[PDB]
């Protein structure tokens with residue numbers, strides 16, 4: 001009964017060929033050519049980094065990693081609080097088909113070990129404040145040959161920074177603008193290994209490329225407008241943070257970051273950076289339903305607040321911020337990014353929105369498995385090319401989640417309405 005399978009429409013702009021590395025390289029190269037185009041802004045220290053800086057350093061890291069001997073048989077871990085440097089090794093690795101495993105930077109040694117025992121990285125990039133945990137983990141995982149320091153210019157405590165690592169490995173006369181990223185099979189080559197005990201979620205490059213179609217979609221993403229700035233407190237190592245940010249880079253936006261929440265810094269940043277869009281994890285929505293300080297800031301450039309909710313809290317937050325509603329999205333680590341998203345300007349309080357392009361969604365009767373019609377409640381199941389290739393070295397868990405037909409069973413109860421909006425119950 002195809003009428004009861006909700007399908008995404010055609011993408012505004014058709015799905016681009018190329019790896020995720022190649023598409024990020026191509027977009028970023030263009031922005032790099034316009035001086036002063038801002039990529040990231042650290043709200044705490046107030047430092048800006050431009051696309052030219054970001055592009056050049058990413059390309060230098062890609063080439064240095066290649067000369068060091070990394071290739072598609074290798075993985076790297078990136079372990080760090082949100083920062084200006086976080087995406088440099090992520091981009092450099094995607095440029096060369098090296099899989100990236102973000103490790104949650106508040107994981108202790110035990111959680112870290114389990115994460116990295118699944119990802120098995122050869123090189124670990126880490127912030128200064130994570131160095132000790134990584135040193136303690138390296139002891140039990142000798143596969144880690146090299147630790148590189150992210151937020152340092154010079155060597156740090158006997159370890160190379162990203163800058164001196166690059167200098168150690170670049171050929172003479174290296175040209176960042178002549179560099180060409182690696183081409184490979186984007187379905188077979190893993191881009192990201194995300195954590196979901198925790199398991200490892202393998203995401204081929206293909207899932208990111210589809211995300212980049214959604215990201216710049218005027219209905220399912222953000223329209224590419226100049227001088228667009230986003231404020232993001234979301235962890236970069238979590239799919240919500242990872243896949244929104246990569247998409248913002250494709251778009252040329254200014255990504256203003258915070259690595260720890262504070263009420264004044266956050267509202268003052270919205271005001272002073274004239275933020276157009278803001279990202280909140282769910283507990284920060286409850287937080288701003290309680291806030292009264294919002295009223296004291298000029299938030300007239302704010303177009304949207306995006307949520308990775310209860311209909312009550314979302315309604316209150318929208319009102320406090322003087323917005324028509326909340327831009328909700330629903331996704332799992334296992335689906336790369338959001339597979340249901342509030343279509344631009346067509347929000348419904350309490351809905352998670354509509355099926356994104358390339359995807360499909362249904363709800364099924366709980367004890368049965370039978371597909372259901374409008375306004376009927378059952379388990380949400382989704383099918384599309386952003387679904388993980390699988391949990392790493394764990395086929396039983398993978399087969400328990402995704403059926404022989406490619407349907408991923410979300411575990412959540414939902415229903416969809418006559419306009420094809422989904423509601424999670």
Ligand SMILES: COc1ccc2nc(-c3ccccc3F)sc2c1
Nearest residue numbers: 239240306308329331332333337338
């Ligand atoms: C509001 O728009 C968005 C855009 C991306 C997005 N990703 C989400 C997600 C991705 C991975 C894991 C968990 C998530 F909630 S929710 C969401 C919502």
